[PDB]
Design a protein around this ligand. Structure first.
Ligand SMILES: Cc1cc2nc3c(=O)[nH]c(=O)nc-3n(C[C@H](O)[C@H](O)[C@H](O)COP(=O)(O)OP(=O)(O)OC[C@H]3O[C@@H](n4cnc5c(N)ncnc54)[C@H](O)[C@@H]3O)c2cc1C
Ligand SMILES: Cc1cc2nc3c(=O)[nH]c(=O)nc-3n(C[C@H](O)[C@H](O)[C@H](O)COP(=O)(O)OP(=O)(O)OC[C@H]3O[C@@H](n4cnc5c(N)ncnc54)[C@H](O)[C@@H]3O)c2cc1C
Lengths: 504, 504
């Protein structure tokens, strides 16, 4: 009795696969879909790089770690539904070094990095050792509201969304009744908390990032043993209609003079694909902006949101060593991460090879923003044919960062000559790592990004289309909400009730 | 009687070549220098790409245009000293289209782009047509102070340097007595004035940019016939000591226990080069941050400036056509530029091929910031080889932007299949296009960047080391100031007096 209908899913990241997974589970009679993926690869920002097929010879280029907090239960539900082999992830480990101003951190010492005014620096003495307390004071009220109810705490956070993190810290909040900090105190707080320049983005983003990385529930963290791409594999195998790779959508349109439900079309390589009742676009917004969307007649501020919503860059560099020297020689036995102001910024010790004593991968450099753009400028699609500036830079920084136990020569001799790096802003299928909004964008541009378009038949889906940026959870919520709206638009009340019964 | 001395110049851009030109002209007895260039190319961000040896078959990847205003007289003096063939450059031309929200601009039309509140958009009615007036009111006081005396106007501008452009517009200046604007008005001003997200950088940078591109003196603009690289060529030939290419410095140091003047050294590819009495680093700050600078004992805030001073990205795309269809079919006969919210953002019509009737180059895309990062994600150093997504995107955008007189088919027909593109953040020898400081950086971090180091023997030189970012003038001022300090440091009063006499 339900008429035949076809929907189009643009992009086969976790968002589009989740839409397909929900539709497949609902089994709506005479409903079909097409998934078009621009890349020859499926998975998007779920991307494990395997150095061999040996058990632990990999690293995750995209998503890799997941906190067990209530706001991410849909992600863990997806893990359980697919049989993902989860293991513990150590956000903090043992003996992980911290190196700033060429000094190592030491507990119970005043200004161990020698950056305070008292030791010839410009960081105020009352700030240099108290970045944790002072940011917890700036973020904590909003963080606990988000712990009660995320949507409600987000709505209250939006009342100060016009401010950057720096502007909030400089002026003492929205009416000056919080502590006010000078430039260098804010500069030190950013250096100790996030990537270079990121306090010049939205205050609300810094709050939510601290909520996810420093949650008040003090959560357990998890990784997928074997790499996150195992999740992509599992979602691929269940698909009723398989992904069509090497199909880049360059135009999306609706024919408003046609009476049928299936009056939407996409253009791929100059050829029309029509007959769609709804199009789900799941790409990053930069890819969407490059399409010809005139046939959708989008609201001008919705088009503005696609162009202007800010993305942060990110770069990862992973090196293979003949043995885990950080474990055996430095005593770094349970993961964690080493932070520094040296160019590599963050060195992540894998949680998934703690028992291995042979070949081991180190995530030697993990950067955001300008740090990632600078490292990324050394990352090529065809690495040079000993002469690699990036390798040499990483080995030198690793030696300085682990100087308490290692030499440059010992680290260099342990290096096998095999490495991989990836800069997400250089990926043509994303154009960045993830949404990280500027001041006022969440409260002003974001609502127009989600506004109904094409008479409720076009949906902009993905991590940037949610309140949970740079996490899998944002992709899943966005995709679920868009399926809701699709079922609502066509008054499929039986299956809408089933969607809420099964997937809410 | 002057003892033998040797100085090191790191980098052979216009900064490094200007230091050598000044030293060559002073002819200081027994003074020599080394200039090391990491690239196999000399010139840095002076970089003309030649599509053949044909006369006008080129475009400038880096610097290309020069306003004849008093604060850039040193640049124009370098042009005359080197006999550069200057021709007029047309910043504004005739019949250049402007395309926003799929509508073309027309003077005297109220809200031609249909973005105002009255027409379904969110841009306030009183802002939509008066962006130039309202930005002139926000920038104008400081622009005229900069026109009287640049350094005095700069010093006064620094008293509001804590604010971003957006923040100045939102709060009505530093005490709320200027007009206050809501998010969408500021958003439209940014869209009409500069690159995506740049109003979230320093207010002082938006003032200085307006001062240079929209100077109160209404100046003549110039370009170098044959491309800017002719300047690099002329500076190279006069060199007493030739540039040593493929010499990447990775460490700079001074041995303070040594009594000699020549107690500084640099490391290149693991090898030591010593004997230097002064080291001029002229690299972009990202390249400086990658070096091992411990042997210099830099002030911690100076190191912070090196790492955190913000750079903007920039991407250029140039296409060759079999005839200048923008001249012949669209009436765009006098250079100028076309602006749009489409991904190409800005289409620059060359001023050096206005009389040609055959093959002609178009600078089809010129972008900054996130616009440039997005276009740059399609720019590969090994071009794809008809499958080129970037080419097709440019052709489609060019057709929509020139739809009043051209079709996609005719533009594609005229395209020869020869194009070149460049994204400066992907260049390992820069890591960006140019300094574009964030809020508070000019007044807080920049003074420590210029602070005396290694007892007055180490200098950080280049466009980022000046009050004139993204211009050749900043590079020359910075190099001149560094030569001054070198002569002062060694008490060479005769030659310091000669520097003032010849080079001020
Ligand atoms: C460096 C990094 C680390 C991360 N770490 C974590 C982590 O630890 N934990 C976590 O939970 N999350 C993490 N994330 C976030 C997570 O990876 C993403 O939020 C999620 O994978 C986004 O999926 P998506 O489907 O929304 O978008 P995408 O993964 O980008 O999928 C969109 C797809 O559309 C395709 N496409 C693009 N253009 C077109 C076109 N024109 N036509 C057709 N298809 C097109 C793309 O190729 C892509 O496959 C990380 C992200 C990054 C960048
Ligand atoms: C897209 C763009 C457009 C521009 N347009 C204009 C314009 O119209 N007008 C204008 O006046 N200005 C313009 N500029 C600015 C102008 O190009 C620059 O200000 C100037 O060229 C910079 O000169 P520099 O010597 O300070 O730096 P650079 O040109 O960067 O010189 C530094 C040199 O150091 C080298 N180097 C780097 N690392 C090392 C190392 N470790 N060891 C040794 N050498 C190293 C680099 O290869 C480079 O040659 C533009 C800039 C850009 C990016």
């Amino acid at each position: 009795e339900l008429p035949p209908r076809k929907v189009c899913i643009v992009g086969a990241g976790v968002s589009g696969l989740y839409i397909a997974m929900i539709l497949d589970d609902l089994k709506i009679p005479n409903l079909t879909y097409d998934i078009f993926e621009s890349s020859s690869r499926t998975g998007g920002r779920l991307y494990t790089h395997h150095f061999t097929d040996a058990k632990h010879d990999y690293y995750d280029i995209g998503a890799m770690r997941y906190p067990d907090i209530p706001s991410m239960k849909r992600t863990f539900n997806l893990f359980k539904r697919t049989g993902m082999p989860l293991i513990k992830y150590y956000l903090d480990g043992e003996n992980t070094p911290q190196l700033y101003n060429n000094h190592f951190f030491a507990k119970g010492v005043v200004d161990p990095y020698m950056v305070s005014v008292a030791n010839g620096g410009t960081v105020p003495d009352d700030v240099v050792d108290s970045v944790g307390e002072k940011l917890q004071q700036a973020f904590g009220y909003y963080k606990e509201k988000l712990a009660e109810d995320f949507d409600k705490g987000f709505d209250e956070l939006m009342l100060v969304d016009d401010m950057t993190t720096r502007e909030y810290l400089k002026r003492g909040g929205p009416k000056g009744e919080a502590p006010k900090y000078d430039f260098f105190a804010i500069q030190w707080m950013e250096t100790q908390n996030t990537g270079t320049n990121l306090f010049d983005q939205a205050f609300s983003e810094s709050v939510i990032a601290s909520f996810d990385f420093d949650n008040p529930t003090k959560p357990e963290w998890y990784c997928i043993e074997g790499g996150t791409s195992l999740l992509v594999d599992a979602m691929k195998e269940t698909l009723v209609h398989k992904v069509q790779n090497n199909k880049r959508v360059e135009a999306i349109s609706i024919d408003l003079d046609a009476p049928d439900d299936g009056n939407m079309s996409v253009k791929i390589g100059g050829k029309d694909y029509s007959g769609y009742s709804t199009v789900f676009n799941t790409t990053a917004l930069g890819c969407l902006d490059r399409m010809d969307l005139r046939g959708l007649n989008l609201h001008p501020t919705q088009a503005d949101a696609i162009r202007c919503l800010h993305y942060a860059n990110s770069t990862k560099v992973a090196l293979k060593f003949s043995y885990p020297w950080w474990i055996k020689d430095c005593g770094i036995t349970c993961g964690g991460a080493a932070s520094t102001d040296l160019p590599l910024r963050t060195c992540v010790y894998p949680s998934y090879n703690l028992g291995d004593t042979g070949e081991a991968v180190l995530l030697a450099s993990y950067t955001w923003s300008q740090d990632a753009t600078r490292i990324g400028s050394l990352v090529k699609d065809a690495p040079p044919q000993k002469e690699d500036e990036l390798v040499e830079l990483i080995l030198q920084n690793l030696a300085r960062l682990h100087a308490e136990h290692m030499t440059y020569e010992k680290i260099k001799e342990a290096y096998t000559g095999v490495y991989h790096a990836y800069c997400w802003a250089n990926d043509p299928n994303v154009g960045g790592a993830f949404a990280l909004f500027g001041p006022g964008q969440f409260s002003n541009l974001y609502p127009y990004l989600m506004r109904p378009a094409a008479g409720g038949k076009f949906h902009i889906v993905g991590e940037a289309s949610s309140v949970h940026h740079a996490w899998i959870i944002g992709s899943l919520e966005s995709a679920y909400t868009a399926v809701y709206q699709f079922l609502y638009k066509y008054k499929m009340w039986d299956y809408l009730r089933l969607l809420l019964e099964r997937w809410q």
